[PDB]
Amino acid sequence: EIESYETAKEFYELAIKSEPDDLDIRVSLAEVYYRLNDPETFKHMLVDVVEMRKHQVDETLHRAERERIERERRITAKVVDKYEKMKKFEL
Incomplete structure (x- = not known):
């Protein structure tokens, strides 16, 4: 998540x-x-x-809204963040 991939x-x-x-x-x-x-x-x-x-x-064959809202909200924050990154990439 930190992008410290190594x-x-x-x-x-x-x-x-x-x-x-x-x-x-x-x-x-x-x-x-x-x-x-x-x-x-x-x-x-x-x-x-x-x-x-x-x-x-x-x-294997042989043998919540209160949380969901924050998942959605995180996605909405990520969208806005990447849209403003796009606004910079456009220049």
Whole structure:
């Protein structure tokens, strides 16, 4: 979230080194590799994520407004922020 993508990669890899079982961690390194512009390791991670996701789906088959408003409000703040960034990018 801070865009300190090197430090993001460092702790996501430490998370895999400690618990390699969660695909949200795997997907997160894939997104960080995409942001770091590393398409070869990104493609390998995507293939592993997709095959293990197929395995999770197969295994699982064989085996609020008060909060929602703040999600929406955050999105509206992000829209306004990026629109004023666009107003600067136009110049």
